[PDB]
Each structure stands twice: as C-alpha cells, then as structure tokens.
Amino acid sequence: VGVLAAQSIGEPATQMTLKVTSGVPRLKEILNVAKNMKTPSLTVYLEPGHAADQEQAKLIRSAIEHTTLKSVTIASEIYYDPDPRSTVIPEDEEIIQLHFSFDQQSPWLLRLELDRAAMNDKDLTMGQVGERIKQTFKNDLFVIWSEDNDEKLIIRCRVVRPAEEDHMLKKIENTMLENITLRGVENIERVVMMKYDRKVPSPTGEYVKEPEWVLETDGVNLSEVMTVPGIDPTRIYTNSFIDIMEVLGIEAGRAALYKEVYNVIASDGSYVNYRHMALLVDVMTTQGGLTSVTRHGFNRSNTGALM
Amino acid sequence: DGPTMREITETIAEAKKKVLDVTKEAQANLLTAKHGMTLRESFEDNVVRFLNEARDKAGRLAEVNLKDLNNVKQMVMAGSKGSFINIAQMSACVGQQSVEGKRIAFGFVDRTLPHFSKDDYSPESKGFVENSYLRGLTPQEFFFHAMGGREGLIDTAVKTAETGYIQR
Amino acid sequence: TTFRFCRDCNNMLYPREDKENNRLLFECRTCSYVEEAGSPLVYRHELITNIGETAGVVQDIGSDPTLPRSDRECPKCHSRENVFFQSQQRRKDTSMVLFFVCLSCSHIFTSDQK
Amino acid sequence: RYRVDLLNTDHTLDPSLLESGSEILGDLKLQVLLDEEYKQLVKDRKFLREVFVDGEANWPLPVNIRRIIQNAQQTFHIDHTKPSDLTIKDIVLGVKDLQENLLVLRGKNEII
Amino acid sequence: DQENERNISRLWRAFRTVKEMVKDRGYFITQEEVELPLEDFKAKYCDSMGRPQRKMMSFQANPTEESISKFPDMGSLWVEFCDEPSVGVKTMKTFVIHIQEKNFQTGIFVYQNNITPSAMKLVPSIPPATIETFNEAALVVNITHHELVPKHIRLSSDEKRELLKRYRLKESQLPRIQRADPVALYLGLKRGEVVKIIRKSETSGRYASYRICM
Amino acid sequence: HKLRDQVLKALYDVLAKESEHPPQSILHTAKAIESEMNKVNNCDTNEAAYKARYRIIYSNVISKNNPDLKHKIANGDITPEFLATCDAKDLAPAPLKQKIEEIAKQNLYNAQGATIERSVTDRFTCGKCKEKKVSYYQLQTRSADEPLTTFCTCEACGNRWKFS
Ligand SMILES: [Mg+2]
Ligand SMILES: [Zn+2]
Ligand SMILES: [Zn+2]
Ligand SMILES: [Zn+2]
C-alpha cells in the first residue's frame, strides 16, 4: 500500500505547475518542514453573534493588528525651547495652559506630529497613547499632548534631569518610534477582511449560502489571537501547520496537514484517492511529532541500516 | 466567414475603446483606486480583464458560427483532440501574451520595445496579439509570443528535475 | 533644515547651546567661529515623502525623439505643440499623472482633475 | 420520501402496491417496525449532517447499488400493474440480515 | 474600559476551562456550574470595587462514582491560584506541604506569570503525589472545543492489556504522543498510558485509533 | 477640595473670557459649580478619567475653532448631560465632524482587500451542481508537446474540475 500511495502522489506532482506560495515549492515546504513561512497567513472567523457588522469586524481588526509609532507618526522635529513653562512655537500655548492648571528639565523640546486618519482607523484616540508613553516611563519624560479635537496633533515631551542632549534625544526618539507597542499582538501585520459564505443548514432543514465576514492576516501567532474577544475560538485556522501542531496537539496537527496537502494537490490535477494521502500523513505523523522526509528526518529512526 | 470576421474585428475594436477610456480616466487622475490594491494594480487588472473578455467573446462567436461540416469542430466535439481555445486562437484572436501574470514589462526604459514612443499602455504596445494565426503576426507580436513560449519551456525544464527528486 | 558651513573653514556649523543667555549658537568645530541661528528648529525627519514627480526638467527636452507629442495647448502661449511624459519618481504607488511641457513657452503644466 | 404511515391518513400507502396491503392497514406490529426504522433513518440523517458539515452527498464508496437494482429491473421484468408480493416484515428483516452478513473484520472479541 | 475588564473576563474564562478540565478528567461537577455567568462570578469574587480575589477562589473536588468504579485509585484533587505575578519559593512550599498534610495526590497549581526554578525544582517531590502547573494564558480558551481536535478518552490498564493481547502488538509499536502535548497536559496523563482517539473519518464516518504517552 | 476649587477657577476664567461677558456672574458661577458637581458625579477625585474628561471639556471650550461653543454653553447646553456625553467627536465643530465621517468611511473602504472576481462563460455544466455558470483560465503546465490545461471553476456552487 505504501508504494502504491507514494507513486499515486508522486506522478501527479510531476504535471503540476511551477501573493501566496503554491505549487511545487509549497509542496516541498509542507512535505519537508522546514518551519519557514513565506505566507504565514491564518484565517480568523468572527463570533457568530456578529454576523455582518462591518464596524465590529473593523473593531476586531483594530484589536488584533500590531501597531507602533511608525504606523502613526507623520512628522518628527526637534526644538530648542528655552522656557520650561512657555513656548517659542506660537501655536503650542493652549496646550501649555491645559497642562498647567517638576521643573528641572532640559530646555530641548522634542515634537511629534500624527495623522488623524491613522489614529482613528484603529480607534486610538491620542489621549491614551499620551498616557501610554507616560506610564511607559513615568520617571524620565514629561509627556504633554493636544486634545483629540484639534486640527493638528502634537506630542510635547522633554527629558527631566537631576550638554550633548541632541544625540540622546535622537536615540530616545528612535526608541520611541521603534519599540512602543500601541495595540494588537505582535507578528501580525496589515489584516484584511473578505466577505465569505458558508452552506449553513437552513432553519427549515435545507442548505443556503449564507454570507459572513472573515478576518484574514499576513502574519502568524496563535497563543493570543485565540484569546481576543469577539472571536470564534473554535474554528480558527492557520496554514502553518507546525504552529497548529504545537498549540493543538498532533491530532489536530495531522488533520491540518492533511487539509494542507489536499489543498496543494487539489489546486490542480485533482484527484487522488483519500486513503493514499491519509497514509502519507499518518506515516509522517506516527512518532508523536512531525517528521520531515529528509536525509535525516525519517532516516534517523531505529530502522534497518541497509535501507 | 466574412461577416463573422467583421464582427470579430469590431468586437476587438470596442474592447480597445474601453481600454482607451480607462487610460484617459487614469491619466486624468480620477479613479476608484480599487481596495486592497495599488492604483497601477487596479489599472492593470481592469485592462487585462477587458482583453481576456474580448478574446473569449470573439472565440465564442467564431465557434457558434462554425459549420457542422467543419472537421476540427467534428474532432473537438468528438472528444479526442483540440479545444475551444485552439479554435479561437487559430481563427479569431491570439490574445494577450503573458510573463508571470503581468504583461510584458518595460525592459527598455519606459517602453517595451524600441519601435514605440515612451510611456504607452495601449495593448498593442505592451503586447496584446490582436491578430490570429490565419493572418499571421506583426513582428512585435511575434516577439511577445516568443516570450510566452520561452517562459513555458524553462518552467518545464526546472519542474521536471525537482519533481523527480521529490518523487524519489 | 539645511546646512550652514563655517565661512572661515568649510565645515558645517554644529548646534551648541548658550549656557546662560539660551541662544542657538551654531559653532564651528574645526575652528572657533560661532554663529547665531535663526529658528529653534534643528533636526527634521519627514517619515513620509511624496515628492519628485517632475524631475529632471532640462532646458532641451524636445531634442529627444522618443518623447511622444500631443495637441494640448500651453496655457501661457497656447502653442499647439507640446511634450508629455510619465511622472519621474518611480515608486510602486505613484500615479498616472501626465506632465505637459511645451517647446514654445518652455513651460510645464499638468492635467489634474481634482 | 421515506416516512410511511400505516394507521394514520396523510402518509398512507396506496394499497395497490402489495396484494396484502389492504388487510395490513391497521396492524400495530408492522407500524411499530416501520416507526423504529424511520427513527433509525433520522438518526442516520443527523449523524451524516454532523460528519459532512457542508452537506456534500456525492462521495467515494464501495459497491454501487444503482446499477445493481437497475439490472435487477431489466432482468426480472418489473411492470406497472402487478402489486409486488413483497411483505413489510420480509423487507425489514432482510436488510438487517444483510447488514450483519457484511464482514470486514473477522474475530470473536468485543474490540473486534 | 481599561484593563480591569479584560482581567476579569480572562480570569472568568480560565475558571471555566479549569472546571471542565476537572469534569472530563473524571470528577463530578454540576452541569450548571461550568456556565456560571460573569457578573455572578464577579459578585462572588469582588472584594472592594473590581478586584478579584484568587486566593479564596480555589476549590476541592472529588472523583465521580463512575470514575471510581472503573479507576480504583484517585483521591481528591485540589486547585490553586496564587496572586503574586512571580512565584514565591515559600509560597509553593506551603502549598506542597498543605497538599501533603491534607493527603492529596494531584495538585493543580496556576501561576500568573513565570516560576522561578527554585520555586519549581521541588515540584517532582513527594511521590506518589503529583503537582501540575498551568498558565491562565494557556487556560483562557478550552483546547478541546476546537473542532480540529477529536475526542480523547482514557484507557484503564486492564483494557489496555486486553488491547495488546488482541492486536498482538508489544507496547512499542503503537503510535506515540508526547508528554508535553497540549491535549496530554489537558488530560494530565503520564508515562505508559493509552489514549483511544475517536475522530470523524471521511470514508467510514467514525474511526478508532490509539496512542501511547511515551 | 483643591481640585474642586481649581476646576472652579478654570471655569470662572473661561466663562469670564467669553465674548458675552455675562453680567449674571453669580448665575454663571452657579453654572460652573453645578458643572463641577455633575462632573465629580462620575468619580469625585477617585479616578484619573475625571481629569481626562476635564481636559476634554476644558480644551473644547478653549479651542477656537470653535468660539461659538462659549456662547452656546453660556445660553444653554445643560451640563449634567455633558458629564455623560463623552461625545467630543460629535462637537466643536461640525466641519471637523464631517471630516471625521469621511475619514472613517475611507478607512473602512481600505480595510477590505482583494476581490478578484473570476470572469465566466456558460458552456460547460458543473461537475457537482450541474449548472452553467462556468469560469475558466488558460496556461500550459506539462512539456511542450501538448496544449494548455483548460482549467475550470464553477460559480453556482464553487466547484473545480478540468478538461483535457
Ligand atoms: Mg529497522
Ligand atoms: Zn570654522
Ligand atoms: Zn504656454
Ligand atoms: Zn457547480
């Protein structure tokens, strides 16, 4: 049976073709894992209580997508404001008297400028990002900000001090730009939502292509995306089956793997029978863990030295 | 047949008209800027969609004209050889040539091939073989056809070795 | 945000601060020449750039053959000859803007329809 | 398609399908047999609907029935007039007898 | 709201998962109990305004009559929820001593965050009592309710021996399963145990298989 | 009480700074104190959200754009509602509001991504559904001696098959 299955999988891999990886290289990766991504996508299904609420779907997107200051910063400039309690810049006076209604700071103003669209696309009012960096340090940085209702969005910050301040401010703002998370889980990038459908049982006992919205990504993580609210934790799914195996146990691992291999070999030239594919999956998973057929993977088993 | 050929010609002509209209809209900087895609991506998608629809419509027109005594029709509805796309390409239109999804890129700076002025996107300049195997190809279209075939050959020549190794 | 060099020795002045009068002393580091700057702006980043679409306008564009020709009029001289070409700043997210330059008035004008 | 009533009115058989169909219209014993068979069928329906969650009905399976019953018809000359001499008890016993005489695993223990 | 509501809901769902952990492990818990609503949970476990008190939130549990009827030897289990984000060596030492004093053999311990190795070097102490560790992050979502995970059930030693004698294997030709597997940790089984696996096949519908936890 | 009197001082300052200098000074400081009590009806110096709402209302009064809000609060805008608004996005001013909805609409458009749509024909029938909504593609996969692949894609149910 094994040789039969091997040939029946091998020959229609010869007449098969060559965004997303597919074809021969994807088959090589998933048959030869090689925990490398090249498309680490994972489909996310919403809670059924939110069937079609686009605002809800966007809200989950804003909860899930990783963002730093790169996502929100338009402009950064530096300033020498000598007065610790008044502004050389004409516009930043109302902000001063807002935050004035604790002195020993360098007179070296750092200024930021954001995009309103890039804030409220993700429902980040700038108030919590101001207090976010405020609680990020609380020890070294005055952080002063605008109202969300202004026509220009600026963050005022100075270093408190108990010479040379230019390059320290440069390094500090570099760190500010790079490392401050705002919301969302890391390793998740720009996420899009499609309008799928599903042959759901009809209430009168038939089938209907009832549509619903799905969240789709371009990164991979599992230990957190299951934990976000408003999600279906049951039907989540990822292409990168190694992570599926790690989080869900190798039964779900081999099921996902079979799904993946069937997807690849049925993108064209379908179909082979099920039992051959199942046998390949099982002999590749019958060790408690994933075992690529490499020069070493299955080869370094307690098996006959001659073969 | 003559009238069917004339209809094929005017079909391709109105497809070209649609393409030109889109190019004018794009060059006038008002476009919908299709979601999930960049401006030029939307433009390319629209034009490729239009050209392939044109080819399909023309091929259908030729096939439904074609007589029941036509022997290539006899074989193609008789199973064994040939195809709808084979009939279409032999008689009506070849269609847009391809180099991995995108059509033929500007290898020369700003142009596809040194017989046109710079910065065109009209389909004949970037590689739509409007013509048909009966009438033969204008030499630029001949070159683009050579491109597509070469792509197929090299893809075969690599996939065979890799699939042999993985089979073993 | 531009650089001012020391006139006494061609090296750019560096920002350094008055410790007591609180002024922007652009001082030379090579020699001891010092200079008072004009604005408290020193460093400048521009995390988003969107400029360069009209690059390389030389005085004799019309001498090239490979540029196409059209029939719009220059809205300074109304000559019916002109030369147009794609935006120069080749990014993946630029536009289909056409920039028309006429040989008569030697003047550039676009065709934006916002 | 499947539900049969032998004592009620709406799903009553036409009695000309079987010559002994009129007199059995009313037997509680055959009604019980049909009802439990129908319950078996609906349990199977629920089970299939939970295993093939989409609802695809075409599937790879062993030996085809349709050709067999078709050539059974074309061999033994079914007609449009003669009521069949099949009896309900005979049908529902024969299906279970075949059900068990199918054999893939030989053995004697509980696990097998 | 800020993080209080997320903390409350996460703790609530983790409680749900631990309750069903214990239920399918074979210790009787009322069916109503596992869907205890969040506001009732907070009403049970709010001290002053929004703070949950995990120290008293733990609970004891007892094997079912049925699980005793098959498995002759399970004492009462006991769960724990320390409140420190770290893990204190003396805190867990008191915990393990309390397990020893109360005569318990299975001790469920849940940590907010990391455990110092000094507070986990003596976890494998006092056999036959066993100590098990869990993150709330690992317990915020029940793993088994994912639809790719099939049903898992446990084998008694007797029927395992019966299985070996029937299929004529010897104890090593079974397919394996890791100790560090998520479903293995969910069931809490140890070395040398066999898990029957029922999964929804596509060529016969329902199909059986077994694994060994080696 | 220091925060109480500070908020009161700020409120008296911003209403005295209004273009309508109110001769009803006791009435407007009554407005100020009643806004103080309805403001502290949220937390009363127990949470920083009280300060945050204070920042919101204080800077909305200041902003200019808009100035007319000063007269509108002086002549109306009953402040116990304005504890419980949290509606800064729907005030001060309307043009910025309209800007906000058009920004949100464009963001929602840009969220949802690629929607390639599979141009069809009507000649073949589905392998499973058996209806004619069939869509295709062309390319050749194997070696040169044979033609294209003639890929198929049903759209009545989504089926895929192939023809030689
Ligand atoms: Mg061996
Ligand atoms: Zn100098
Ligand atoms: Zn002009
Ligand atoms: Zn179909």
Side-chain angles (χ1 to χ4, degrees), chain A residues 209, chain F residues 125-134 153-161:
Chain A
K209 315 174 90 77
Chain F
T125 189
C126 171
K128 328 280 188 159
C129 80
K130 304 165 105 188
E131 275 88 7
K132 293 179 147 207
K133 286 165 184 180
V134 296
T153 314
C154 178
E155 316 296 321
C157 64
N159 181 25
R160 187 261 175 188
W161 68 91

Side-chain angles (χ1 to χ4, degrees), chain A residues 75 111-114 116 146-147 149-154:
Chain A
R111 258 282 293 274
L112 295 176
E113 208 275 334
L114 318 173
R116 297 178 66 88
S146 167
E147 190 183 6
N149 285 106
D150 290 331
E151 283 84 0
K152 200 173 179 67
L153 262 61
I154 48 167

Side-chain angles (χ1 to χ4, degrees), chain B:
Chain B
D1 174 33
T4 63
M5 271 275 268
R6 190 252 308 150
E7 285 186 353
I8 288 167
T9 302
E10 65 91 17
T11 301
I12 296 170
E14 68 90 19
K16 288 215 241 191
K17 191 255 292 179
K18 279 166 177 167
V19 166
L20 194 81
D21 178 83
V22 162
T23 56
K24 208 210 184 178
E25 285 295 320
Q27 280 155 323
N29 288 320
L30 72 164
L31 293 175
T32 179
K34 287 187 57 57
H35 49 88
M37 291 185 317
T38 305
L39 205 63
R40 321 177 64 105
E41 310 289 325
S42 314
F43 170 64
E44 287 298 322
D45 169 87
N46 273 344
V47 60
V48 172
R49 180 59 69 111
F50 273 130
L51 277 297
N52 287 320
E53 285 184 356
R55 187 252 311 276
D56 168 86
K57 219 177 296 178
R60 180 176 178 179
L61 210 46
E63 207 270 349
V64 303
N65 164 57
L66 211 52
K67 227 153 185 175
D68 274 12
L69 274 297
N70 196 301
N71 316 133
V72 69
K73 183 172 206 264
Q74 278 205 121
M75 293 183 286
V76 74
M77 62 80 71
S80 74
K81 291 308 257 202
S83 69
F84 173 80
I85 192 80
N86 282 29
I87 282 179
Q89 280 211 300
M90 293 177 70
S91 67
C93 181
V94 169
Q96 163 65 274
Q97 296 301 282
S98 178
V99 173
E100 53 267 17
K102 321 177 179 181
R103 40 185 186 158
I104 297 89
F106 314 95
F108 289 84
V109 55
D110 310 330
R111 38 178 170 158
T112 64
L113 183 63
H115 311 290
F116 322 119
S117 44
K118 294 182 156 293
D119 309 353
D120 196 351
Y121 298 99
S122 73
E124 62 278 40
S125 178
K126 188 169 283 294
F128 175 57
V129 188
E130 53 86 21
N131 198 357
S132 83
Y133 282 172
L134 207 55
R135 313 196 206 174
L137 318 171
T138 77
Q140 307 88 308
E141 291 165 320
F142 173 60
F143 209 61
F144 304 137
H145 196 54
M147 301 285 218
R150 173 78 69 77
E151 179 153 333
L153 272 295
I154 59 175
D155 181 73
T156 296
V158 179
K159 67 184 285 292
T160 181
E162 217 69 16
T163 199
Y165 172 66
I166 191 166
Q167 195 266 352
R168 184 177 188 273

Side-chain angles (χ1 to χ4, degrees), chain A residues 199 201-202 205-207 271 273, chain D residues 45 49 52-56 60:
Chain A
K199 286 182 180 289
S202 159
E206 306 84 358
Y207 274 123
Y271 67 100
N273 206 339
Chain D
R45 173 161 157 93
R49 199 168 282 256
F52 286 140
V53 60
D54 45 354
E56 168 55 78

Side-chain angles (χ1 to χ4, degrees), chain F residues 24-32 34 74:
Chain F
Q24 52 272 12
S25 292
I26 181 63
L27 188 144
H28 272 61
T29 198
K31 256 195 172 287
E34 80 207 7

Side-chain angles (χ1 to χ4, degrees), chain E residues 80-122:
Chain E
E80 198 63 37
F81 295 96
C82 277
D83 279 299
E84 45 166 359
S86 168
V87 176
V89 290
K90 216 178 177 72
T91 75
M92 61 79 70
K93 180 251 285 182
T94 50
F95 177 53
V96 64
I97 283 175
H98 173 270
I99 294 152
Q100 191 42 252
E101 285 155 334
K102 293 285 190 179
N103 189 251
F104 292 147
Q105 78 296 333
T106 54
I108 295 90
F109 190 73
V110 176
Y111 44 86
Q112 299 301 135
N113 299 292
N114 63 6
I115 312 99
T116 178
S118 47
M120 61 79 71
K121 46 158 54 68
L122 72 164

Side-chain angles (χ1 to χ4, degrees), chain A residues 302-305:
Chain A
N302 51 3
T303 319

